Each structure stands twice: as C-alpha cells, then as structure tokens.
Chains A and B, each alone.
Chain A
Amino acid sequence: DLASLAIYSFWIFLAGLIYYLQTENMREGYPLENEDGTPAANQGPFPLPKPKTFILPHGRGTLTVPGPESEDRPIALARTAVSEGFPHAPTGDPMKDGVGPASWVARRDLPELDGHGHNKIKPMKAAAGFHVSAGKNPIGLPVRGCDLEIAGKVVDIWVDIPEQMARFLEVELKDGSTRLLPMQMVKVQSNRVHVNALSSDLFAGIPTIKSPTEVTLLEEDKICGYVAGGLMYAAPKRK
C-alpha cells in the first residue's frame, strides 16, 4: 500500500543522504595516514568526494578540497611505544615547538579581510570611532599570570570591525614590547585582567606580529595555540 511504499522509499533516500553527508565531511584530513605519514591501507567504506573549488574573495585565489594534505612545518615529537596508538612525546619545549595543546596550523600569513576588503581586526586606536560601550574597560588594567605575578598592562583592545566585538587585549610587557592575548582566555576584573593559562614568565614567549596594526591568520594561530597550551604546560606554575 501507499504508506509501506512511502516509508521504504524514505529509508533508501536516508541511506543515500548519509552517504553524501559522510563524503562531504572527508574534504579535509583524508586520506588517513599511519603515524609515519604514509597512507593507511584501510580507508573505510566511503570514497573521497570529487574536489570542489571555492573562489575566495578580494583576489586571494581559490581552494580545492580534497587536495594535497601537508603540515608545511616540522613536528618535534617522538614515538613512546613500538606499536600504533600510543602518545608522541615532545622532543623539545612543546610551547616553543607548537605541539599538543600548543599546536598551531600554518594558515595563510595574511589578515582576514571584511566584506569591503579592509582588515577585519584593527587596534581600537586605528578604528574610528569604536569605543567600549558597556562592561569594564580593561585598557590600563595590569595583566596577572597564574603564578599570581604581574606580566604587564593592557594598552589597547583589538576589535572585529564588521562583527563589532573585542578579539584580543594588546599587553605591554616589562621591556616595552606588546603581545596579543585572546579575549576568550582572560578574565576582566575590577582592578586587573587575570590569565590562568600562562604564568608571568611565559608572556615574553608569546609569538609576536610582523606589523603593529595588523595580525595575520598564521599569527592568530601561533598566539591562540601558545596561550591554550599553557593550561597543560604552565601547570607547575599555577597556584
């Protein structure tokens, strides 16, 4: 009958949808590799989709996925076991080496542009006329580390112009250089910013930016990676 035909029809549709959906989600990360970087033998039942090509705006070219997959950077890790499936130990300082929770991707060394082709993220000093409209203005507050030691002071907010939100605090360290910290890893308080992820001594080690008025996708990744890795790696210094 019409109802039994409909429900059978639907279950076959759903099987085809789930196939289509699964191969779409294989456009990054695939094919699978062994720990040595060579391609795994067993890829599972789903094949790689036909590539698609995104035309990126503002003349920044195209992306074709799936395409050739490399890290385009060295990975300072060594095997801890003689068989697959165990952890890979850092060979140096995982923070400096950008491994584990300190991992960054080698994204493009350009800044994200807005719809009009202007830099998405400026310091608030170069953004007319952006102001703090609500909440505690953190500018001029001392920045404290998880060792309960002062690392510096906030000297500006870097804002997302089109999204109208704060993305980083620019911090002036003891030596007069500045670093970006992500908004999402700091606690703005009445009388300080607290940064749990890093102890005061690890603020100098935060990756720095080439231009003082712009930050690139590569730089965002090294800074964000670095600060997140603190939760694991600056644990001996957390009180």
Chain B
Amino acid sequence: YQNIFSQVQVRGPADLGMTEDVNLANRSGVGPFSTLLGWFGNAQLGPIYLGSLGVLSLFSGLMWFFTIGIWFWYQAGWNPAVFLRDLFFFSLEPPAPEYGLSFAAPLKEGGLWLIASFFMFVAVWSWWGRTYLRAQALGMGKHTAWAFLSAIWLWMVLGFIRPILMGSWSEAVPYGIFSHLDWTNNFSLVHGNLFYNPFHGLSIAFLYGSALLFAMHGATILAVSRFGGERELEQIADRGTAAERAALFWRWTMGFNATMEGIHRWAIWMAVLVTLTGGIGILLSGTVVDNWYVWGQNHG
C-alpha cells in the first residue's frame, strides 16, 4: 500500500470550521459529502462564505461568460448543431486598430469584447480582495493574496497594460479556444520568436521547476506519511523523524536539504516566478523590443 488513495474513509459530524473573526451570517451550511472525492482527499463539500465581494465576483464573472457565449450562439446562427460543431472555432475579437484605445467601436466589431473585458476586470480584482479578506478573518498571513497577484500580473499585462502602452485594444487576446492559441503563436512570429526573449526562457525554467519541485515534495511527504509527514504545521513547531528522514533523503541524494517550513518558501517562489518573469517578457514585447532575434544579436 502506497497512500495515493485511502483504504478506509471515516465520516463524523459536518465540520462548520474555525470561527476566529469570520461573519458566521455569510457562511452557507454544509453541502453533500462526496465518497468519490473522499478516496483522494476530503468528502465534505461546503460550507462556503459568500458575502458582498463573493456575489460581485460571481455575478460579474457569469456576465463575462454569458457575453462571450451569446456572441458564439449569434455566430452559429442560433443553431445548436453548428454551436456544438464550431465551439473551438468561434471568437469574440477585440476592436480593430482603427478605434485605437477608444470605447467608440460598435458592438459587432469590438464594443462587445470591451463589455466582456470590463466584467472580467471586476470579477478578478474583487476575487483578489476576497482571498485577502478571508485570510484576515482567520488571522492568517496574506501569502495566498500576494501569490495570486503574480498571476493577475501576466493577465493585466496581456489584456490591459500592454494594449494601453501600444495604443490599441486590438493588441489584446480574443475570447475563443482556437483564436487565443493562434494569437499566442502569432505574437511569437511577429516579435521574432519568443524563444530569444530571455524572460520567456526563465518563465519556462520556473514552470518546469514547479513541476519537478511538487513532484519531489508530494513524493517526499507520501514517502514519510508513515511518520505523520502530512502534518506539516506540527512538524514545524516540533520536528519529528518524518521531517528528519525527508531532509536526509535529499541531503544524501544531492548534498543539501530543506526545513518543513523552508520547502514551502521554495514552493511559493518557484511558482510566482513563472507569471512574474512571464509578464515582464510580454510587457517588453513590442513596447521596447520589436524583435527578440534582433535584440539577442546585440545582446542589448
């Protein structure tokens, strides 16, 4: 037995969770218990804290989602056969270059893209405020919110910051499955191949390292789960043979090692540096560097 799935589930009363300073008025009640989920992790769905930023995000994010789909249905001539057939092929495209950074564009040739983007802007930032506020309620550090900001960075660059600096909304990414892929491939071609963007290449090393490190870490905690390894917080406050055997596996393999707390600083950083370096690479593309081949040839 290797501890990828549980051999036995137990259930007790619904866990309505810790209280600290949270407003209990805004938490739901428990949802079902999924026995399926329970083989891998926890069986309990809910509760969920809603509140004001909860509903703003949730309404706002559905308005973005519906806006795109209503335009996909329109493109499909309102035919459910064509809709399902061409699903990956439809695209809400930003305004033409003609309209620059203007909100003048008609609904069928930009305006609809802008409406959907506004909604998405409210949805994401309100959700960011939510990850901070939930943590504050429980008296926890703001790690989750600051780590999330790194993801927001690259998104803000692609759809907002870079389209502004370049003086056109047409530079932004379209809402569509195959269209957003073509954009990505188009961007690289037009900027002389992103492989020569040194930020793109760091972005990849970190994406990579995220895969290699969570592979290492997950594997390591499962390997020492026979000494209560998963109980990271109590192993922090009172190091056990699990923390010791874990540190020593890696010391003896590759010559150095982590703490039970310290591995999590490695973890949060490896990950945020993906979108951090990624966003810088993109912001500098067409604003400062026209061609990463050409730039690379000068080195500067």
Q: Which residues of A contact B (CB under 8 A)?
A: 1-4, 6-7, 10, 17, 21-22, 24-29, 54, 56, 63, 103-105, 107-108, 112, 115, 124, 127-138, 157, 159, 161-167, 182-188, 217, 220-221, 224-225, 227-228
Contacts and interface: CB of A to CB of B under 8 A. Distances in A.
B277 interface: yes
Contacts of B259: 24-28
Contact of B231 (A112, A130, A166): A112
Nearest to A166: B8
Interface of B: 1, 3, 6-13, 15, 18, 33, 35, 38-39, 42-44, 198-199, 202, 225-228, 231, 234, 236-245, 247, 256-263, 265-266, 269, 277, 280, 284, 288-289, 295, 299-300
B299 A4 contact: yes
Contacts of A217: 234, 238, 240
Given A3-B284, A221-B227, A135 B238 contact: no
A70 to B, nearest CB: 12
Contacts of A182: 226-227
Nearest to A30: B259
Given A17-B269, A164-B12, A217-B238, A103 B228 contact: no
A225 B244 CA distance: 12
A135 B1 contact: no
Given A133-B10, A187-B1, A225 B284 contact: no
A137 B9 CA distance: 9
Contacts of B244: 103, 105
B241 A21 contact: no
B1 to A, nearest CB: 5
Contact of B240 (A162, A164, A221): A221
A221 B8 contact: no
10 contacts: A25-B258, A107-B239, A130-B10, A166-B8, A166-B10, A184-B226, A187-B1, A217-B238, A220-B228, A225-B241
B266 A21 contact: yes
B8 A134 contact: yes
B105 to A, nearest CB: 31
A156 to B, nearest CB: 11
Contacts of A4: 299-300
Given A2-B284, A3-B300, A224 B241 contact: yes
Nearest to B245: A103
A98 to B, nearest CB: 9
B7 A133 contact: no
A157 B8 contact: yes
A159 B12 contact: yes
B261 A132 contact: no
Contacts of B44: 164
Contacts of B38: 133-134
A68 to B, nearest CB: 13
A166 B280 CA distance: 47
A105 B239 CA distance: 8
A129 B12 contact: yes
B140 to A, nearest CB: 12
A159 B10 contact: yes
B227 A225 contact: yes
A164 B262 contact: no
A165 B10 contact: yes
A115 to B, nearest CB: 5
Contact of B9 (A10, A22, A135): A135
Given A2-B288, A184-B226, A136 B241 contact: no
Instruction: Name the residue among A10, A25, A27, A167 with the largest chain B CB count within 10 angstroms.
Output: A25
A137 B1 CA distance: 16
B238 A184 contact: no
Given A25-B257, A184-B225, A135 B240 contact: no
Nearest to A196: B1
B241 A133 contact: no
A217 B238 CA distance: 9
Nearest to B13: A129
Contacts of B237: 54, 56, 63
A135 B266 contact: no
B199 to A, nearest CB: 7
B265 A24 contact: yes
Given A28-B259, A131-B11, A6 B226 contact: no
A238 to B, nearest CB: 16
Contacts of B198: 7
A10 B202 contact: yes
Nearest to B284: A3
Contact of A1 (B7, B266, B288): B288
